[PDB]
RNA sequence: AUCGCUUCUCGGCCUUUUGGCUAAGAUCAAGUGUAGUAUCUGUUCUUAUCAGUUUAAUAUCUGAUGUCCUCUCGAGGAC
């Protein structure tokens, strides 16, 4: 299930359990550019959270530069609410 | 009619003739045939076909 | 009902095939399509690559290669050469025959570099010795059973084939040539087959293929078959720019 | 000499052959794809260039052994062999030389003012030079306006053997610390670049 | 169109028949559908030429081919049934031989020609094993001192070697 | 820097495309997918067409993981050979007869459209016009 | 894995082509197999 | 093969312009667009020849180009949309003779889409905000602070999704400091796809349209359709806030329109004609490129017409209404894909096609013997005009062009060893054939 | 099927899209809306129609602008 | 030669089937969560049209299965 509410400049992050993979693509290499999520998954207590776990945010969710060369980040907050 | 694919599923006899009625028709088309096509000026000043040309040419004028 | 309406819309297979300009295509189905005209443009478009065979079929997509038994997969030449085949079958019945006992033996205490492969063998290979394999181009979807579709529609005479010859008593290799075939004998004596009079054969209705011979023992080529004034069978059984590529490297 | 390179409004250059004693003209070859061609030119007796209508420029090749002479809709078919979006509209090639004993080339020139060349490699030395000069230069200083650059020049149908010289000009116009980080990637000197840069203009044209 | 595969070789596959079919003509069917037991090939096949006069001048072609070494005949689908033919002319090939000697019959031996040794010249007699030996009476009897190339036949029944 | 290895493998996953399993041609898939993204615009077209044409039979499968990883193959076949011959490969089935075969075909195409929907703008077929529309595009046609 | 060729049953592991080979369909399709054998072939 | 690509003359015609003090001086800078190329020329006062400083790559196309100033700053930067999903802000160091990226946001896929903005892009006319636009269904809009520093900041972008909607295009409206707006043109296949008949074909109406900004609650309202006679191409923004009022002018096929929302009657205007022309009777005329001076004193509008012909529009105005409208003949010059009128007493009038020109103006197109034309002027009948050669402009400047370049050739046609290129190139009367050659004259 | 309401919420996200019913009608009038924003957006084919007839920039994107309207004939029934 | 035996030789490939003893010399064998796929296994289908639903086509699903006498669902007939 995705929020796809569009896109900001709002930084995404990863719990620790969550650390290093792609959002989607699932991979564990070669990250090229940073997340951005909407306000809606932006506020509140969802500040800062993993994307994923929904752990506290400390590492940076990133995109499998697969995922840049097929425009799969140009889609907007990709979070599974 | 030959055995050919573009008739296979048509079962009835008049329908098949007349499709390959027309196919017929277009192979005749699509096909180059000199003889009215490549087309030949007599000295003349005035244009014939290939066939009238040799014609006239070989039954005693040109 | 309404279905049942369009289904008398649902014309005929005859209907399609004479409307058409391209009448290939149109096949058995093709009528309850909800827009035949441009399903049957479509098929007949340059250049596009039709549905897979089998999604009438009841049998899933190689249930159908169920049955049989197969041999395990040949590696490329240029990896053979480098001779880790056997190395690794080595390996492999050291280990069969092993213990477990001695295997944890041989954990506790390793044959550490049993074996060796050099380098540059590999590197060589890899980038020396690498070759195109043989490629499909566009179209040619590969469906259940195409490996043993034999191969068709070389209507040529030349086609010949070394088991061909060696089986037919003709001969294999350089002489293929100036081989003329046992069909080619009869070919000069009445003549070749009615439904390739578009096919001339060598020796027979071409001339001499490279360096043959005349005679009429085994291994020639005798009469070039003639007419009593001297005209071939056909033919002539007796016998009577600037290729450079722009872009190429030095 | 003897070979017809017909070239249609949208599938693509169609070649023919007449043979003269039976006087026919017969298809044997022609693409596999649909291109829109504004003008074609010859390369070689098998190699023809394209232009097209929306932007690109391809060379396609006849496999190097084609049954010149016999009797979906074809027979046996070209291959595609480069593939370049220019990025704009090419009216016209043609091969040619420029400067006196400057190897040949291909002159293009577009619809917006714009005249250039593409210019053959002799020596995977140089290929593979400004191969990995272009590659690190797209990584390290990608164009202006928002664009990917092997995107741009993949617009319609990928990129096949075609460096961008004016992505590997810019080199000159690129800062000290850049030059320095890629020259040093190829271990070279910005110096052994911006010289291997030029000549090649050099020997070409002007 | 239906050729009889006859002294159908038994390894002599049913691919390679197939592309001398095509090499003759229209390949359209090599069929040597076998015993239900064995699986090699059964001594009579189907070859369909779609074209009669093409099967028929194939048919003419491909018998005495050496189909697994041996004369294999395309056909309509040893009690001394061999006849000694003498005053021979020398100037015939093989399958030519075949041909002219298998008129009223087949040919189990193609015409084996007692030439000299010494040179490959013969002196004028051969021996061919043909179908029956009312076939060989008729065929002798036809060329009973008739018309053979350069040196009229002279044809009967064999004698034993 | 697959551009090397990718004629070395090729035939290896040929081999696996052509049965063994479903886990089998999941994984030959997989691979396809990820040799294409790398190897996107280094020339090695004529592999990756080969290899289209062993990975689109298998358009037609249920099991999730296959029919999933086969799509996966399709999007980076799509960047690394080009959307003319994905869109090729997807003419003949979007007006089928069937339905199963309709909906995978204007999936693949949905897909493919998504991204890359401005290249396609050369690569529409020429689609002739009846009586009472025009469906011919004259824009494309004018000379000059 | 294994196979019968005569039922055309694939199997993971021994247990079960033991079982397979202890004839319900295979019982069948094998008693019809030498049926239909029978059949053909018969100084 | 393996083949390099080199361009030896970049691509000459022009597709875009703004002008503005892109070095922060009040020496005015000219940045046009060439297709994938952003070039910059500064024309020196003096002898009027125009040097071009900076000519950059970019990789892409540029479908839209924007200058704006900050409120207050002194620096003119300037927002590219092309076929990206990107909006970018670009700047001009002098001191490195090179364009600086500001700012830099995705909103989408890339390639000239539909449904993904660029095509249209606006700005406020104080720089408070841009709006985005695509051709359908999507608008955004962007704010812009200094910050503590001044340096430019760029928050997340507003929304206005609207389905089935085209847009014939977007503009600032000048308001004073109140919320900015936005006033596109719009229109609506959506029945015209439901009715089998053809007649919703016919029978709909753009509809002059504002959107508004409301920066206290952060998104954007609709405020203010009114369905318009009939479609015009675009709309030529009037100087509002302090000077003038607000509102546009429409400048629809044939007639120009003033109009604005509140209590303003809508202004008409017919086009007045040349007189005794050529032109088949069909013909219509619609309103090709404009550009405004709007100066100390007062403002005006320049348009110019499809046979060449520019004309000059001031606004005849009361207390916050205008009244009537003037548009009175100025001059005729090549057809223009943009003029940029300087201050320094010129205008850049960027050629379609073939070389294009630099004038100085002379006169303020006003007070000679040549008519006037109105907007209270009833009539039952048209106006005319007779033009004349060049009066109240003078050919300053004139860059070469090779755009279009129809035709070439590749030979050694003078008696010299190296060859020369024969170019055939330009459109209809004003085409040619030119001779290309590696040598300076 | 909550992947159908994301799935003609994607329908309702991408025009131009399809599904297994779509007619010939709507397939081909939004391939020939897109081609006309192309048209536009690409600044060199639009030198090639304003060159090709003899029009000028502003009458051929106004041409385009309407045709954009009821591109290819009227609708199906 | 036969037939009875004796011995030996040979051939199969058959058959035989192991290193003795002790306290059978002693001892003992420690995996999930989720779904889901596939494979085995077990099982279940002649009925006669036609109408529809349905389906690419089948199928499925739904619905009934000529009157009159008469003798034993069955029969000869006016029809
Ligand atoms: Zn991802
Ligand atoms: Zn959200
Ligand atoms: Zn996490």
Request: charged letters at 25%.
């Amino acid at each position: 299930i995705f929020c796809r509410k569009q896109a900001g400049v709002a930084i995404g992050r990863l719990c620790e359990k969550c650390d290093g993979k792609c959002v989607i693509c699932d991979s564990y290499v070669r990250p090229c550019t940073l997340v951005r999520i909407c306000d809606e998954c932006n506020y509140g207590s969802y500040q800062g959270r993993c994307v994923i776990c929904g752990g506290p945010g400390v590492s940076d969710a990133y995109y499998c530069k697969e995922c840049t060369i097929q425009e799969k980040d140009r889609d907007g907050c990709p979070k599974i609410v | 009619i030959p055995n050919t694919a573009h008739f296979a599923n048509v079962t009835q006899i008049e329908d098949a003739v007349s499709l390959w009625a027309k196919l017929k028709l277009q192979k005749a088309s699509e096909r180059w045939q000199p003889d009215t096509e490549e087309e030949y000026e007599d000295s003349s000043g005035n244009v014939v076909n290939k066939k009238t040309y040799e014609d006239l040419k070989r039954q005693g004028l040109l | 009902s309404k279905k049942k309406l369009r289904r008398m819309n649902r014309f005929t297979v005859a209907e399609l095939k004479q409307l058409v300009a391209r009448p290939d295509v149109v096949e058995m189905h093709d009528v309850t399509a909800q827009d035949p005209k441009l399903l049957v443009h479509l098929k007949a478009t340059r250049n596009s690559v039709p549905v897979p065979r089998h999604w009438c079929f009841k049998r899933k997509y190689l249930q159908g290669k169920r049955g049989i038994e197969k041999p395990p997969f040949e590696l490329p030449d240029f990896i053979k050469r480098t001779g880790i085949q056997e190395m690794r079958e080595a390996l492999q019945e050291k280990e069969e025959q092993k213990t477990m006992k001695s295997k944890m033996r041989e954990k506790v205490r390793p044959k550490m570099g049993k074996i060796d492969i050099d380098y540059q063998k590999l590197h060589d290979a890899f980038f020396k010795w690498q070759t195109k394999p043989k490629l499909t181009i566009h179209g040619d979807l590969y469906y259940e059973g195409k490996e043993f579709e034999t191969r068709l529609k070389e209507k040529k005479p030349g086609d010949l084939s070394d088991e061909l010859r060696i089986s037919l008593g003709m001969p294999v290799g350089p002489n293929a040539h100036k081989v003329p075939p046992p069909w080619l004998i009869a070919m000069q004596r009445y003549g070749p087959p009615p439904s390739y009079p578009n096919l001339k054969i060598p020796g027979l209705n071409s001339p001499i293929p490279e360096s043959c011979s005349f005679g009429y023992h085994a291994g020639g080529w005798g009469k070039p078959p003639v007419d009593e004034t001297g005209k071939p069978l056909y033919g002539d059984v007796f016998g009577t720019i600037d290729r450079t590529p722009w872009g190429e490297l030095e | 000499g003897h070979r017809v390179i017909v070239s249609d409004v949208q599938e693509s250059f169609i070649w023919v052959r007449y043979k003269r004693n039976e006087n026919q003209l017969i298809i044997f070859a022609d693409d596999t794809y649909p291109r829109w061609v504004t003008t074609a030119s010859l390369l070689d007796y098998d190699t023809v260039a394209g232009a097209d209508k929306f932007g690109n420029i391809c060379v396609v090749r006849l496999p190097p052994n084609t049954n010149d002479e016999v009797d979906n809709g074809a027979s046996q078919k070209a291959e595609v062999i480069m593939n370049y979006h220019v990025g704009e509209t090419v009216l016209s090639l043609q091969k040619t030389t420029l400067i006196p004993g400057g190897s040949e080339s291909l002159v293009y020139t577009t619809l917006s003012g714009g005249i250039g060349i593409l210019v053959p490699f002799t020596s995977h030395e140089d290929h593979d030079f400004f191969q990995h000069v272009e590659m690190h230069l797209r990584s390290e200083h990608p164009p202006l306006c928002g664009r990917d650059h092997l995107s741009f020049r993949s617009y319609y149908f990928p990129v096949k053997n075609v460096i961008d010289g004016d992505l590997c000009e810019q080199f000159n116009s690129m800062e000290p610390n850049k030059q320095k980080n890629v020259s040093e990637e190829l271990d070279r000197t910005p110096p052994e670049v911006s010289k291997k840069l030029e000549d090649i203009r050099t020997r070409y044209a002007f | 169109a239906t050729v009889y595969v006859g002294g159908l070789d038994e390894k002599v596959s049913e691919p390679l028949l197939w592309e001398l079919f095509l090499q003759a003509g229209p390949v359209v069917n090599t069929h040597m559908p076998k015993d239900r037991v064995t699986g090699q090939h059964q001594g009579y096949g189907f070859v369909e030429f779609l074209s009669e006069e093409d099967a028929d001048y194939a048919i003419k072609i491909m018998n005495m081919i050496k189909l697994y070494g041996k004369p294999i005949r395309v056909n309509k689908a040893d009690v001394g049934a061999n006849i000694f033919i003498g005053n021979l002319d020398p100037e015939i090939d093989e399958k030519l031989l075949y041909d002219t000697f298998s008129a009223f019959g087949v040919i189990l031996q193609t015409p084996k020609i007692m030439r000299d040794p010494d040179t490959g010249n013969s002196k004028g007699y051969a021996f061919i094993n043909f179908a029956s030996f009312d076939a060989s009476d008729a065929a002798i009897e036809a060329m009973n001192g008739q018309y053979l190339c350069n040196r009229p036949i002279t044809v009967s029944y064999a004698f034993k070697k | 820097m697959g551009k090397d290895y990718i004629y070395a493998v090729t035939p290896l996953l040929e081999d696996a495309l052509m049965d063994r399993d479903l886990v089998h041609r999941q994984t030959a898939s997989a691979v396809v997918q990820h040799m294409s993204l790398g190897v996107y615009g280094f020339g090695c077209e004529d592999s990756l067409n080969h290899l289209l044409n062993y990975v689109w039979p298998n358009v037609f499968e249920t099991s999730p993981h296959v029919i999933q990883a086969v799509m996966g193959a399709l999007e980076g076949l799509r960047v690394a050979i080009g959307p003319c011959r994905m869109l090729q490969y997807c003419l003949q089935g979007l007006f089928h007869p069937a339905r199963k075969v309709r909906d995978v075909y204007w999936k693949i195409y949905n897909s493919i459209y998504i991204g890359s929907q401005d290249a396609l703008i050369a690569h529409y077929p020429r689609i002739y016009n009846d009586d009472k529309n025009t469906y011919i595009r004259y824009e494309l046609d004018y000379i000059l | 894995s294994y196979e019968c060729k005569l039922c055309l049953t694939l199997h993971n592991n021994e247990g079960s082509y033991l079982a397979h080979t202890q004839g319900k369909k295979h019982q069948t399709n094998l008693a019809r197999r030498a049926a239909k054998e029978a059949k053909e072939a018969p100084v | 093969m393996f083949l390099y690509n080199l361009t030896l003359q970049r691509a000459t015609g022009i597709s875009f312009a703004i002008h503005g003090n892109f070095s922060g001086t009040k020496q005015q800078e000219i940045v046009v667009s060439r297709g994938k190329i952003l070039e910059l020329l500064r024309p020196d006062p003096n002898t009027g020849k125009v040097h071009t400083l900076l000519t950059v790559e970019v990789f892409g196309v540029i479908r839209s180009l924007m200058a704006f100033r900050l409120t207050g700053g002194t620096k003119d930067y300037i927002v590219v949309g092309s076929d990206s999903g990107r909006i970018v802000i670009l700047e001009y160091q002098p001191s490195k003779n090179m364009f600086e990226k500001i700012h830099q946001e995705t909103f989408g896929k890339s390639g000239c889409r539909r449904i993904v903005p660029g095509q249209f892009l606006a700005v406020d006319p104080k720089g408070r905000a841009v709006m985005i636009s695509a051709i359908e269904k999507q608008k955004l809009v962007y704010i812009l602070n200094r910050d503590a520093a001044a340096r430019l900041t760029i928050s997340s972008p507003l929304e206005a999704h609207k389905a089935n909607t085209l847009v014939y295009h977007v503009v600032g409206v000048d308001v004073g400091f109140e919320n900015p707006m936005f006033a596109c043109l719009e229109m609506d296949y959506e029945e015209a796809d439901n009715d089998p008949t053809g007649e919703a074909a016919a029978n709909t109406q753009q509809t002059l349209t504002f959107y508004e900004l409301d920066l206290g609650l952060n998104h954007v309202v609709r405020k203010y359709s009114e369905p318009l006679e009939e479609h015009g191409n675009f709309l030529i923004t009037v100087p509002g806030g302090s000077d003038g009022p607000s509102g546009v002018l429409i400048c629809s096929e044939n007639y120009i329109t003033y109009k604005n929302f509140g209590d303003q009657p809508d202004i008409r205007c017919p086009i007045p004609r040349r007189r005794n022309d050529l032109d088949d009777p069909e013909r219509g005329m619609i309103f090709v490129c404009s550009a405004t001076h709007k100066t100390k004193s007062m403002f005006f509008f320049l348009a110019q017409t499809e046979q060449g012909d520019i004309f000059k529009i001031t606004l005849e105005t009361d207390e916050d209404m205008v009244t009537e409208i003037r548009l009175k003949y100025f001059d005729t010059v090549p057809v223009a894909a943009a003029m940029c009128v300087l201050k320094t007493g010129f205008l850049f009038v960027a050629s379609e096609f073939g070389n294009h020109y630099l004038y100085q103006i002379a006169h303020l197109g006003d007070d000679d013997e040549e008519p006037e034309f109105s907007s209270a002027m009833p009539l039952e009948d048209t106006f005319f005009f007779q033009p004349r050669p060049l009066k109240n402009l003078v050919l300053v400047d004139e860059l070469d062009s090779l755009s279009p370049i129809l035709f070439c050739q590749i030979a050694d046609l003078a008696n010299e060893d190296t060859p020369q290129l024969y170019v055939a190139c330009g459109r209809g009367p004003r085409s040619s054939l030119r001779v290309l050659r590696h040598g300076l004259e | 099927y909550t992947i159908h309401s994301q799935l003609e919420h994607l329908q309702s996200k991408y025009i131009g899209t399809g599904h297994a019913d779509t007619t010939k009608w709507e397939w081909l009038v939004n391939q020939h809306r897109d081609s006309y924003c192309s048209y536009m957006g690409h600044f060199d084919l639009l030198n090639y129609f304003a060159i090709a007839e003899n029009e000028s920039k502003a009458r051929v994107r106004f041409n385009l602008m309407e045709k954009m309207l009821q591109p290819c004939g009227p609708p199906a029934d």
